[PDB]
Design an enzyme around this catalytic site. Sequence first.
Site, PDB file in Angstrom:
ATOM      1  N   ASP A  13      66.856  37.517  42.941  1.00 31.49           N
ATOM      2  CA  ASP A  13      65.637  36.826  43.362  1.00 31.49           C
ATOM      3  C   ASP A  13      65.470  36.934  44.876  1.00 31.49           C
ATOM      4  O   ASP A  13      65.728  35.983  45.629  1.00 31.49           O
ATOM      5  CB  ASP A  13      65.675  35.372  42.877  1.00 31.49           C
ATOM      6  CG  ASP A  13      64.334  34.669  43.100  1.00 31.49           C
ATOM      7  OD1 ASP A  13      63.341  35.381  43.347  1.00 31.49           O
ATOM      8  OD2 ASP A  13      64.335  33.423  42.944  1.00 31.49           O
ATOM      9  N   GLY A  36      58.439  24.318  45.983  1.00 28.13           N
ATOM     10  CA  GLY A  36      57.752  24.520  47.248  1.00 28.13           C
ATOM     11  C   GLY A  36      58.725  24.899  48.377  1.00 28.13           C
ATOM     12  O   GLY A  36      58.290  25.389  49.409  1.00 28.13           O
ATOM     13  N   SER A  75      61.125  27.048  47.555  1.00 30.02           N
ATOM     14  CA  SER A  75      61.517  28.392  47.100  1.00 30.02           C
ATOM     15  C   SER A  75      61.236  29.423  48.152  1.00 30.02           C
ATOM     16  O   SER A  75      60.209  29.415  48.807  1.00 30.02           O
ATOM     17  CB  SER A  75      60.746  28.738  45.852  1.00 30.02           C
ATOM     18  OG  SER A  75      61.257  27.940  44.752  1.00 30.02           O
ATOM     19  N   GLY A  76      62.191  30.391  48.211  1.00 26.19           N
ATOM     20  CA  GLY A  76      62.084  31.465  49.180  1.00 26.19           C
ATOM     21  C   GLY A  76      62.624  31.149  50.555  1.00 26.19           C
ATOM     22  O   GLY A  76      62.829  32.049  51.340  1.00 26.19           O
ATOM     23  N   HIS A 110      60.556  35.511  43.177  1.00 25.91           N
ATOM     24  CA  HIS A 110      59.664  34.726  42.341  1.00 25.91           C
ATOM     25  C   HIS A 110      58.540  34.063  43.130  1.00 25.91           C
ATOM     26  O   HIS A 110      57.622  33.512  42.516  1.00 25.91           O
ATOM     27  CB  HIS A 110      60.459  33.683  41.500  1.00 25.91           C
ATOM     28  CG  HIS A 110      60.794  32.402  42.178  1.00 25.91           C
ATOM     29  ND1 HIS A 110      61.991  32.132  42.816  1.00 25.91           N
ATOM     30  CD2 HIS A 110      60.022  31.282  42.304  1.00 25.91           C
ATOM     31  CE1 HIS A 110      61.962  30.848  43.203  1.00 25.91           C
ATOM     32  NE2 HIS A 110      60.762  30.335  42.932  1.00 25.91           N
TER      33      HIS A 110
END
Length: 223
Positions: A84, A175, A177-178, A40
């Site tokens: 994801d 922020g 994320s990942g 995402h």
Amino acid sequence: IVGGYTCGANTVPYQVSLNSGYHFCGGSLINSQWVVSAAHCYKSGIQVRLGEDNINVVEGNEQFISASKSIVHPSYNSNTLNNDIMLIKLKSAASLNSRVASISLPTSCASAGTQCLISGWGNTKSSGTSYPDVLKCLKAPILSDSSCKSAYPGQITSNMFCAGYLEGGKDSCQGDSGGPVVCSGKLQGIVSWGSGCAQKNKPGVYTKVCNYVSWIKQTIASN
Ligand SMILES: [Ca+2]
């Protein structure tokens, strides 16, 4: 990261910032040419920034390397965030050193109760907004599958796990994320989703990286 701490410059040397003119997501360096992030976080035109501490100051240990390719998982579902995960190939290999270093992929899945290190430049407020410039860290335990499903009924797949604190106050956030969830020295999660940040009974949900090692290895063997 809400309720975390300042990591210390370059003490999380596999953490990357993904930049499209601004920081927008974290990622994890898994070898000199490849970064694991969340699907995402896909954007076109990604520059990978390694060796960062303050993302708004060039401090001298950074390497900024354009992505050449991004590969979202073939089964990513952006509605449920099942699968994801994304791979990002760097245009040129990073120079690995004490401050830019890869993190191992797991052999086995992590255990419930294990305390993991989650890091990123995401929001530090549960209610409101404040983005730090320096990298923040949080230690958070993996929660049982049945606790995670009770928190998010009808939403947790076998490719997700929860980590954090059901009382609230400590979590990853927008922020982050990942970015990585590292448990016993291996990349076990990717910051994926949650209801708000650091809210009571709503822990963070993370992509279960141990389910994807075969995909990652065959993809990196082919690209
Ligand atoms: Ca910097």
